[PDB]
């Protein structure tokens, strides 16, 4: 499925603030957490597992990009798909979303679907 469909919600002007790397179910994963640039709004946690769902082949192309935007500190748009993970405690700690894209953002407009 495409990233910016009508079923995948997105969040604009997000700034990646944390990053956790680990392993679950014999497959590496990573979770980010983004607070808005202007400080307002609630954080948006979104993970990504290596080989669990239909979003598997886009793992390494995203981990290298989610780590880039972390080092700089630039505003990004983030696409997520709600309610993918069904793990007992993994859902309660980080989130149940699924990272499916990191569109870079300019001052006014953001380059990416919506």
């Amino acid at each position: 499925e495409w990233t910016g469909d009508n079923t995948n919600a997105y969040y604009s002007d997000e700034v990646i603030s944390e990053l956790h790397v680990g392993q679950i179910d014999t497959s590496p994963y990573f979770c980010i957490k983004t607070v808005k640039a202007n400080g307002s709004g609630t954080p948006v946690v979104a993970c990504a597992v290596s080989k669990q769902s239909i979003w598997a082949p886009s793992f390494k192309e995203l981990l290298d990009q989610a780590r880039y935007f972390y080092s700089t500190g630039q505003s990004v748009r983030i696409h997520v798909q709600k309610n993918i993970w069904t793990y007992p405690l993994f859902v309660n700690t980080f989130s149940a979303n699924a990272l499916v894209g990191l569109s870079s953002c300019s001052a006014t407009q953001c380059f990416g679907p919506k």
Partner: antibody, heavy 119, light 108 residues
């Protein structure tokens, strides 16, 4: 066909079986799969569910310890091993694909359905 | 657990008319309820997931809806090929209790 569900035609009340449900044409490492039963009254009921690799497994309240769902990647099988079959549990026993891999969405294309019977 | 009440159990409708099932849950589910279609002597297939989102490859005549404790499937224009059983899925938690299943009877 992508789903075969081979195994199980008749077992005395207390024996055991193993239902394969071999897959053909999708990423079997992903796509958390599970089992779903019918009934002689045509009412579907849940049986089991296995995660991606198999480290996570769930069962309903009616079934705990009798059924055990497995998963053998590199061969694309499920191998539901039954045990202590009561007078009930005479059903079709489909296996599903859990559309998008997640277990929170639904069931993609189902199988053909075996026929277990206990008498 | 959570029980799903699929009332009524039969829908005798002339072809070419909108039908509406009814799947009232016991506990508030929110929007995690799905629908299937099992023709007689066959394996079911997904129609609408999350009670609002359809699935590609499905004829657009099916249009689910509902939120809270009242969820319904609205086939806008029935045909003589829609005589099948329509079940309810539930995925708020374990276990995944199905529904009863209704028929779409078409009498000439």
């Amino acid at each position: 066909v992508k789903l075969v569900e081979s195994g199980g035609g008749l077992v005395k009340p207390g024996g055991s079986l193993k239902l394969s449900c071999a897959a053909s044409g999708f990423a079997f490492s992903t796509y958390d799969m599970s089992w779903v039963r019918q009934t002689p009254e045509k009412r579907l009921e849940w049986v089991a569910t296995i995660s991606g690799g198999g480290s996570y497994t769930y069962y309903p309240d009616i079934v705990k310890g009798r059924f055990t769902i497995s998963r053998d990647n590199a061969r694309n099988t499920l191998y539901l091993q039954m045990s202590s079959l009561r007078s009930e549990d005479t059903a079709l026993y489909f296996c599903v694909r859990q559309y998008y891999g997640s277990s929170n969405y639904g069931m993609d294309y189902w199988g053909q359905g075996t026929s277990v019977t206990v008498s | 657990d959570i029980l799903l009440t699929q009332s009524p159990s039969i829908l005798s409708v002339s072809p070419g008319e909108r039908v509406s099932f009814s799947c009232r849950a016991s506990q508030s589910i929110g929007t995690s309820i799905h629908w299937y279609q099992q023709k007689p002597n066959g394996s079911p297939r997904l129609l609408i997931q999350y009670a609002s989102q359809s699935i590609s490859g499905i004829p657009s005549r099916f249009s689910g809806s509902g939120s809270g404790t009242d969820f319904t499937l609205t086939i806008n224009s029935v045909e003589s090929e829609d005589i099948a059983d329509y079940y309810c899925q539930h995925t708020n938690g374990w276990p995944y209790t199905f529904g009863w299943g209704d028929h779409a009877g078409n009498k000439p």
